[PDB]
Design an enzyme around this catalytic site. Sequence first.
Site, short mmCIF file in Angstrom:
data_model
loop_
_atom_site.label_atom_id
_atom_site.label_comp_id
_atom_site.label_asym_id
_atom_site.label_seq_id
_atom_site.Cartn_x
_atom_site.Cartn_y
_atom_site.Cartn_z
N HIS F 200 0.82 -1.23 0.00
CA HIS F 200 0.00 0.00 0.00
C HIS F 200 0.85 1.27 0.00
N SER F 204 -1.03 -1.29 -6.44
CA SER F 204 -0.86 -2.48 -7.24
C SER F 204 -0.23 -2.27 -8.62
N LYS F 226 -15.50 -8.67 -7.00
CA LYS F 226 -14.66 -9.68 -7.67
C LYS F 226 -14.07 -10.66 -6.68
N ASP F 227 -13.62 -10.14 -5.55
CA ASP F 227 -13.02 -10.97 -4.52
C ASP F 227 -14.02 -11.96 -3.91
N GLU F 270 4.44 -34.27 0.60
CA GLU F 270 3.18 -33.91 -0.06
C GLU F 270 3.45 -33.17 -1.39
C1 HEM Z 1 0.35 -16.20 3.04
C2 HEM Z 1 0.90 -15.79 1.91
C3 HEM Z 1 0.53 -14.53 1.24
C4 HEM Z 1 -0.53 -13.68 1.43
C5 HEM Z 1 -1.68 -13.78 2.42
C6 HEM Z 1 -0.35 -12.64 0.47
C7 HEM Z 1 -1.26 -11.58 0.36
C8 HEM Z 1 -1.25 -10.69 -0.68
C9 HEM Z 1 -2.32 -9.85 -1.03
C10 HEM Z 1 -3.67 -9.81 -0.34
C11 HEM Z 1 -1.92 -9.11 -2.10
C12 HEM Z 1 -2.73 -8.07 -2.84
C13 HEM Z 1 -3.67 -8.75 -3.85
C14 HEM Z 1 -2.92 -9.40 -4.98
O1 HEM Z 1 -2.38 -8.71 -5.87
O2 HEM Z 1 -2.87 -10.64 -5.04
C15 HEM Z 1 -0.59 -9.48 -2.40
C16 HEM Z 1 0.17 -8.92 -3.41
C17 HEM Z 1 1.47 -9.34 -3.69
N1 HEM Z 1 2.12 -10.40 -3.13
FE1 HEM Z 1 1.44 -11.55 -1.80
N2 HEM Z 1 0.75 -12.82 -0.27
C18 HEM Z 1 1.34 -13.95 0.13
C19 HEM Z 1 2.50 -14.55 -0.35
C20 HEM Z 1 3.33 -13.98 -1.31
C21 HEM Z 1 4.48 -14.59 -1.87
C22 HEM Z 1 4.99 -15.97 -1.52
C23 HEM Z 1 5.01 -13.66 -2.78
C24 HEM Z 1 6.22 -13.77 -3.65
C25 HEM Z 1 7.20 -14.66 -3.51
C26 HEM Z 1 4.16 -12.51 -2.75
C27 HEM Z 1 4.35 -11.37 -3.48
C28 HEM Z 1 3.33 -10.45 -3.71
C29 HEM Z 1 3.48 -9.36 -4.70
C30 HEM Z 1 4.69 -9.06 -5.55
C31 HEM Z 1 2.32 -8.67 -4.70
C32 HEM Z 1 2.01 -7.46 -5.55
C33 HEM Z 1 1.16 -7.85 -6.76
C34 HEM Z 1 0.82 -6.71 -7.70
O3 HEM Z 1 0.60 -5.54 -7.30
O4 HEM Z 1 0.74 -6.93 -8.92
N3 HEM Z 1 3.15 -12.74 -1.86
N4 HEM Z 1 -0.19 -10.46 -1.52
C1 HEM Z 2 -0.81 -22.04 7.02
C2 HEM Z 2 -1.62 -22.61 7.91
C3 HEM Z 2 -1.71 -24.08 8.13
C4 HEM Z 2 -1.35 -25.08 7.27
C5 HEM Z 2 -0.76 -24.93 5.88
C6 HEM Z 2 -1.62 -26.31 7.94
C7 HEM Z 2 -1.34 -27.54 7.34
C8 HEM Z 2 -1.65 -28.75 7.92
C9 HEM Z 2 -1.52 -30.01 7.28
C10 HEM Z 2 -1.02 -30.26 5.87
C11 HEM Z 2 -1.92 -30.94 8.18
C12 HEM Z 2 -1.99 -32.43 7.96
C13 HEM Z 2 -3.42 -32.68 7.48
C14 HEM Z 2 -3.67 -34.14 7.38
O1 HEM Z 2 -3.04 -34.85 6.56
O2 HEM Z 2 -4.54 -34.64 8.13
C15 HEM Z 2 -2.30 -30.27 9.36
C16 HEM Z 2 -2.77 -30.90 10.48
C17 HEM Z 2 -3.18 -30.22 11.63
N1 HEM Z 2 -3.20 -28.89 11.80
FE1 HEM Z 2 -2.69 -27.59 10.53
N2 HEM Z 2 -2.14 -26.09 9.16
C18 HEM Z 2 -2.23 -24.77 9.35
C19 HEM Z 2 -2.71 -24.09 10.48
C20 HEM Z 2 -3.13 -24.70 11.65
C21 HEM Z 2 -3.52 -24.05 12.86
C22 HEM Z 2 -3.59 -22.55 13.08
C23 HEM Z 2 -3.84 -25.06 13.78
C24 HEM Z 2 -4.31 -25.00 15.18
C25 HEM Z 2 -4.55 -23.87 15.84
C26 HEM Z 2 -3.63 -26.29 13.10
C27 HEM Z 2 -3.83 -27.50 13.71
C28 HEM Z 2 -3.65 -28.70 13.05
C29 HEM Z 2 -3.94 -29.98 13.74
C30 HEM Z 2 -4.46 -30.19 15.14
C31 HEM Z 2 -3.65 -30.93 12.84
C32 HEM Z 2 -3.80 -32.42 13.08
C33 HEM Z 2 -5.21 -32.84 12.62
C34 HEM Z 2 -5.20 -33.26 11.16
O3 HEM Z 2 -4.36 -34.11 10.76
O4 HEM Z 2 -6.03 -32.78 10.35
N3 HEM Z 2 -3.16 -26.05 11.84
N4 HEM Z 2 -2.11 -28.93 9.19
C1 JAG Z 3 -5.84 -5.38 0.97
C2 JAG Z 3 -5.94 -5.63 -0.52
N1 JAG Z 3 -5.23 -4.80 -1.31
C3 JAG Z 3 -5.20 -4.87 -2.66
C4 JAG Z 3 -5.98 -5.93 -3.39
C5 JAG Z 3 -5.94 -5.98 -4.91
C6 JAG Z 3 -5.85 -4.58 -5.53
C7 JAG Z 3 -5.01 -3.50 -4.81
C8 JAG Z 3 -4.37 -3.88 -3.46
C9 JAG Z 3 -6.80 -6.89 -2.60
O1 JAG Z 3 -7.48 -7.79 -3.16
C10 JAG Z 3 -6.78 -6.74 -1.10
C11 JAG Z 3 -7.55 -7.67 -0.22
C12 JAG Z 3 -6.82 -8.53 0.59
C13 JAG Z 3 -7.47 -9.42 1.43
C14 JAG Z 3 -8.88 -9.49 1.50
O2 JAG Z 3 -9.47 -10.40 2.39
C15 JAG Z 3 -8.75 -10.69 3.53
C16 JAG Z 3 -8.28 -11.99 3.80
C17 JAG Z 3 -7.51 -12.22 4.94
C18 JAG Z 3 -7.20 -11.17 5.82
O3 JAG Z 3 -6.42 -11.40 6.92
C19 JAG Z 3 -4.99 -11.26 6.81
F1 JAG Z 3 -4.57 -10.20 7.47
F2 JAG Z 3 -4.60 -11.14 5.54
F3 JAG Z 3 -4.42 -12.33 7.32
C20 JAG Z 3 -7.65 -9.88 5.55
C21 JAG Z 3 -8.42 -9.64 4.41
C22 JAG Z 3 -9.62 -8.62 0.67
C23 JAG Z 3 -8.95 -7.71 -0.19
#
Ligand code: HEM
Ligand code: HEM
Ligand code: JAG
Lengths: 49, 74, 99, 239, 64, 378, 54, 54, 59
Positions: F200, F204, F226-227, F270
């Site tokens: 921000h 974008s 859209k979202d 996985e």
């Molecule tokens: C939990 C993982 C992530 C979350 C929640 C997240 C969230 C977001 C959100 C909400 C936006 C704005 C909407 C969009 O353009 O898609 C954004 C933009 C962006 N994210 Fe992520 N992101 C994540 C991981 C990543 C990763 C792994 C990368 C790169 C390695 C990345 C790079 C970017 C970039 C470059 C933008 C700008 C896009 C643009 O303006 O064209 N993000 N991210």
């Molecule tokens: C990025 C966020 C997270 C990812 C990617 C993730 C991913 C996973 C995956 C791949 C498994 C194995 C699923 C299966 O084969 O059964 C798993 C299991 C589990 N996750 Fe998560 N997890 C996330 C967040 C959380 C959070 C916030 C909690 C608890 C507060 C949680 C609690 C558990 C528990 C209790 C299991 C064992 C039950 C099961 O196997 O389904 N996870 N998680």
């Molecule tokens: C905050 C955001 N900014 C922008 C774009 C595209 C266009 C321009 C920049 C988005 O789509 C945008 C957005 C991002 C997330 C949205 O839903 C949420 C999903 C999760 C959320 O929690 C948190 F914090 F990300 F973990 C907070 C919001 C809704 C909208």
Amino acid sequence: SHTDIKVPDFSDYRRPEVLDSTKSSKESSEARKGFSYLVTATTTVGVAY
Amino acid sequence: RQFGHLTRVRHVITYSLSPFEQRAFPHYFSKGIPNVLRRTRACILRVAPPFVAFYLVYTWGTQEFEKSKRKNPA
Amino acid sequence: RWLEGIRKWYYNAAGFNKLGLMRDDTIHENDDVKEAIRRLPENLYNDRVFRIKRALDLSMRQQILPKEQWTKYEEDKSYLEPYLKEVIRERKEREEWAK
Amino acid sequence: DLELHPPSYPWSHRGLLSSLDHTSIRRGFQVYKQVCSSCHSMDYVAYRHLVGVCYTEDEAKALAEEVEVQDGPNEDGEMFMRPGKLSDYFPKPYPNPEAARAANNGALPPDLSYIVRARHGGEDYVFSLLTGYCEPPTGVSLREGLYFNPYFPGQAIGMAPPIYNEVLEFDDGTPATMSQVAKDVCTFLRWAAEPEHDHRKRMGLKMLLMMGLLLPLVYAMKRHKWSVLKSRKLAYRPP
Amino acid sequence: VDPLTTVREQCEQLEKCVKARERLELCDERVSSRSQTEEDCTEELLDFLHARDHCVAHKLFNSL
Amino acid sequence: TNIRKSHPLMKIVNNAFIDLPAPSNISSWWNFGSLLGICLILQILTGLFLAMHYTSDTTTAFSSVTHICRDVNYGWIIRYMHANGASMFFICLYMHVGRGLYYGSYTFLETWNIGVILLLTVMATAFMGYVLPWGQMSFWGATVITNLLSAIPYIGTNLVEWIWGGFSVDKATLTRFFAFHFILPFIIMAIAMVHLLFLHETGSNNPTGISSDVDKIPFHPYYTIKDILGALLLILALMLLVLFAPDLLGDPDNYTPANPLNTPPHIKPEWYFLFAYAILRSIPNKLGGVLALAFSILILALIPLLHTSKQRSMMFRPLSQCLFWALVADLLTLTWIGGQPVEHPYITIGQLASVLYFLLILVLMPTAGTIENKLLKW
Amino acid sequence: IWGGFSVDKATLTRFFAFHFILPFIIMAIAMVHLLFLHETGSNNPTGISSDVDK
Amino acid sequence: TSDTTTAFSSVTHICRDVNYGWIIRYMHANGASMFFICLYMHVGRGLYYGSYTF
Amino acid sequence: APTLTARLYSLLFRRTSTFALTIVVGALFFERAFDQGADAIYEHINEGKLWKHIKHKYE
Ligand code: HEM
Ligand code: HEM
Ligand SMILES: CC1=NC2=C(CCCC2)C(=O)C1c1ccc(Oc2ccc(OC(F)(F)F)cc2)cc1
Ligand code: HEC
Ligand code: HEM
Ligand SMILES: CCCCCCCCCCCCO[C@@H]1O[C@H](CO)[C@@H](O[C@H]2O[C@H](CO)[C@@H](O)[C@H](O)[C@H]2O)[C@H](O)[C@H]1O
């Protein structure tokens, strides 16, 4: 002059109800809103479920 | 940066309609289908060739693994 | 000279012309380009502004212009070159002086 | 170490919206009971699990009462044996894995609770295994007790063909052919591994329908709001 | 009486089966005729069963 | 004046959510950010609800997960939502990164690098998550992958046993993996907020790779609607897996409990790690393989420095487009190869694919940029 | 709350899960707490405005 | 561990077998007291000096 | 008489208060209708397979 500006033809985009330029849109206003808001209302009922 | 501080633009007119005055899907198939085909043709031999190559290296390698596990006539 | 065949091909393949853009509209804005843009006269700047507005609007619709309306390869003036060249030439002088 | 993968049999629950044949489950349970339960454990299925699926509450109570189980301690401090109830799980044949190995010449019979989910092919695999036992090809023999099955990995298993014609009389009087006995037990083992199956698919249908409704509605809402911008025309008017 | 062993026979008399069954019988009286070679005939059996049990699957379940 | 711009809490919401100036022309590839957010929140809720029923003790662990699926009310739908939700997360992640690469969004350096960190954090989370059920693939996956760190000279062997809290992956490893797996998503949420905080600053990027200040639209309603549509489609994909094929993206061997003796046939992580797992197996030397597996992810941090083209987006760049789609197809090949046994022809294909991965990023795509420039007299 | 008819197996397990998550929720709310404090700045012992001597 | 059978045992296992698990455990328990001491003092301040007007 | 969509607007959708009450009433009537209707579709698709269909045999 700015009097040379006249709004482009939007016939392609208009609803059938508002195509006729010699008739008032106000007849169809009740209807047109109804349709679009029904879609929204239906959606909300679905999301609620 | 807020709306009203983005950038400088001069002499550009924008006409538009209310969403209640117009259709959500004007000429959706009529103009949609040909535009899709144009979009698809434009990118096809940038997008497709590597996935062709994947498909070939995949199906080659799969049945190569099968032949190799069979006994040889000797 | 001989690669002019490929330059003309690449131009159409690249396809920014289909949005009614000139090459210098597609330049990624770094600090030099920003300054070059900033130095453009009213006419050249407002053209740039519109051409982009038009392109963005087309991109929004996922459509292109009619083929008659496409930027001809030959008619693509390099409008930003004189400004950008000097902006760069200037900075390189300051960078020199700093050593 | 060549490999023959199973064919895809047309199960009554094969399709996206197709439920399990519960009468097939009822038969299949008895195929576990009469045949398997002296070799394989099935620790995650209790007698209560059967109620409203293949048996009534009262039928499942009778099936539970039929078996031994340890319980205790009593006030004296001793561990007694009692008639089972709904809360009891299906009892393990042996007290431990090491005892199980001894009874089956080294090989450990796997627990069957999840065997459909724990083996590639699932019910298609198990059905092929149970019906696929045949005479070995020339150039071949394993250790005295390890049988030939073409569907088992490495082509040699440590299980005696367990199913054959009339190994059990079924409660509903279905002709107990080898292939009928295998079909039923697979259908039960499917339900064992995945009790949720029928509910899961009920939810699937209701999801597909609601999405059928909501997606084009939300898409229409999208196009509606965006229509201000899709329609718009621009004009450049320098002095 | 088993519907299975009826259908296994029915499918066995198809062109793809009988050609694979001949492949099986070739090495049957190649290894059982020749003396001391560690080569066996699992491969040929599995080729035959693959073709057979594919067909069996397609109509076994009708009789159940 | 309104109480959307005034109120200290609403002010942040109004500026980063409602009145946010967004480019008019951003495509479907911009939805993945929002979807990543939904994924994260989805995992946290489902996860928390699972944690109300799970236990990290090695004896009860497998049993608790199955007890969830059989006795806990709708525990099954929660469990499989969480497992397929993890897949949906990684689908969303790679699509989101791909967008960044293709359209050159990585020029937003801070946003991009925070991204890299987020990626690595979600990876760490999902690796430790898959261990929690304590099945075969869980236990054996964790054992092989962790034990790669022993390849570090001098310290490596200690390091591995210190992560483990013992001499194998056992009681102390599972318990701590539960604790780290619980806390990390919350750390992700924080870093994700910093991620947007930097986004921000600039606003974008868009598909053209040309500045969009001349044609911004407010985020509401255009992108709120859209979202919502995107979210709806994400839920469909998720629930199509959960209700019609919940086992499709997992492995069967994780339905038999963990056995420290009995090794599974072809031990593998996985699906979303398979590409990097293949890269590891390409190099014959073990420490080399580890440093390649590490560099296969970290190279993302290097991408911005490798940028050569005078145009930002690949939209107007045919050569780069092909090379990009080659890089995607190559990654699909590495995923396939990662899933295979170590034999001919999968060794050679794997080697050749891993060569092409690093070749595409470090040599070919940079060269292609400069060739494109010289074709435009640049 | 209990997940049963007494404080038992399901209560302890969920109490562990809630007890783990809540401090993190606290940290968030604590940040909002300060966010509002920095709107006004701090009060002092006199209860008289301190803008003249910060 | 949050399992009812192992729970008490795990907490004691921390204090006896886990390295410096005791000092961690009792820091956490007395840390909870220190938290509440801090809380009531913090509230008292607010009450006495009228910071609650914020 | 004005059109049906128009009658719906004037009676239900104009005041946001009535619009919301409409949604809550509609949600109830939809829920029962959709559930009952979809269950019928499911149980017809799985005729004689379910415990619900074979219950009578043991009662
Ligand atoms: C939990 C993982 C992530 C979350 C929640 C997240 C969230 C977001 C959100 C909400 C936006 C704005 C909407 C969009 O353009 O898609 C954004 C933009 C962006 N994210 Fe992520 N992101 C994540 C991981 C990543 C990763 C792994 C990368 C790169 C390695 C990345 C790079 C970017 C970039 C470059 C933008 C700008 C896009 C643009 O303006 O064209 N993000 N991210
Ligand atoms: C990025 C966020 C997270 C990812 C990617 C993730 C991913 C996973 C995956 C791949 C498994 C194995 C699923 C299966 O084969 O059964 C798993 C299991 C589990 N996750 Fe998560 N997890 C996330 C967040 C959380 C959070 C916030 C909690 C608890 C507060 C949680 C609690 C558990 C528990 C209790 C299991 C064992 C039950 C099961 O196997 O389904 N996870 N998680
Ligand atoms: C905050 C955001 N900014 C922008 C774009 C595209 C266009 C321009 C920049 C988005 O789509 C945008 C957005 C991002 C997330 C949205 O839903 C949420 C999903 C999760 C959320 O929690 C948190 F914090 F990300 F973990 C907070 C919001 C809704 C909208
Ligand atoms: C008297 C012994 C005995 C009987 C009766 C028996 N089993 Fe087994 N079973 C075994 C042993 C031993 C193994 C382990 C084989 C091995 O590892 O080679 C086994 C393995 C299996 C496997 C695992 C195959 C694999 O892919 O590894 C399945 C499935 C199975 N049995 C199902 C059944 C079913 C279904 C029945 C009856 C309806 C049955 N068994 C009856 C002893 C028996
Ligand atoms: C986890 C709990 C809490 C944390 C971390 C926290 C944090 C803080 C901090 C860092 C300050 C600024 C420094 C100070 O003046 O002490 C502050 C001020 C304040 N807090 Fe808290 N607080 C907490 C709980 C509470 C509670 C329970 C109340 C009242 C019921 C409260 C009311 C206030 C008020 C009124 C101020 C302003 C003091 C002034 O300017 O004179 N806080 N808080
Ligand atoms: C005669 C026409 C030939 C054209 C068709 C090619 C396929 C026919 C098989 C020929 C042999 C192919 O070569 C195959 O390559 C791989 C990968 O290098 C080898 O694998 C081996 O070499 C690599 C070399 O780096 C080592 O790291 C690895 O430890 C080792 O297993 C196979 O053991 C070999 O069989």
